[PDB]
């Protein structure tokens, strides 16, 4: 089955012009663990997850841009699911932003979603 | 295959008498996302993961005991692996403390480990 029909459906993103503590509220608010960071257009710059929030406390880092995993692993909306499953394990991550061909963010898949194909 | 032979091998735990920020350093130091919280004996009271650290910032919580998921899902050292895999998805968590029969902590399995049985 294709990623286009499993993914979380309007993405929640953030420009890097926000405080660590705001991001945290964002994550906690929607009950999410993955926050794609987008530029002014909407194109994909990096990814924050609760791990980064705890990195920020741990090393006294203060800005989103300082800690966002600058190089994000992503999925294409026509990329078969099974293949994304394999991808997240092999790289040990639980979520990928889904991108259109311009690196604009159209959604997100988490293992949380993949495990409704586990039954 | 049995959990006893996949698990991470001396556990890293913490009594709740530590600061959020220390826990974070603990997680970042060993490169872990799961911190079992133990009492004076060593028996299993709750679990902290980086998610809780971001909950702590989010709601201005200040103590480990305030935020540790008081009721932890665990695995037995003779519990077959496959079954623990199923357990973490169905409950959407990536790590379980492994317990002996007195609820003392003997190890931990993460999906990170299970995915070396994925090949
Ligand atoms: C974390 S489980 C709850 C849901 O949140 C979704 N999710 C996680 N991160 C995001 C995000 N940045 N935008 C939209 N949905 C998300 C996941 O795909 C899952 O369905
Ligand atoms: C696995 S957690 C360690 C790092 O993984 C990063 N991370 C989580 N998901 C992804 C992804 N899809 N691509 C790249 N890095 C990621 C987080 O920002 C964290 O710094
Ligand atoms: C998170 S991936 C790196 C390793 O850390 C292990 N790990 C995670 N949390 C703990 C812990 N509290 N004590 C010992 N090992 C851990 C995992 O089982 C994995 O092998
Ligand atoms: C899935 S993340 C949301 C909550 O899950 C908790 N959590 C993570 N692993 C476990 C586990 N093995 N048992 C119970 N709760 C857990 C974390 O402390 C967090 O508050």
UniProtKB/Swiss-Prot annotation, chains A, B:
Cite the CBS domain residue spans from the record. Answer: 7-63, 68-119
Q: Name the positions where S-adenosyl-L-methionine binds.
A: 52, 69, 73, 92-95
Sites binding S-methyl-5'-thioadenosine sit at 8, 12, 34, 110-113
**What role is this protein assigned?**
Required for O-acetylhomoserine sulfhydrylase (OAHS)-independent homocysteine (Hcy) biosynthesis. Together with MJ0099, catalyzes the condensation of sulfide with aspartate semialdehyde to generate homocysteine. Likely functions through persulfide intermediate.
Family according to the record = Belongs to the L-aspartate semialdehyde sulfurtransferase family.
Q: How does it assemble?
A: Homodimer. May form a complex with MJ0099.
- What does the entry's domain section say? The C-terminal cystathionine beta-synthase (CBS) domains can bind different numbers of S-adenosyl-L-methionine (SAM) and S-methyl-5'-thioadenosine (MTA) ligands. Binding of SAM and MTA triggers a drastic conformational change in the protein, which evolves progressively from an open form in the absence of ligands to a closed form when the four sites are fully occupied.
Q: What is this protein called?
A: L-aspartate semialdehyde sulfurtransferase
Organism for this UniProt entry = Methanocaldococcus jannaschii (strain ATCC 43067 / DSM 2661 / JAL-1 / JCM 10045 / NBRC 100440)
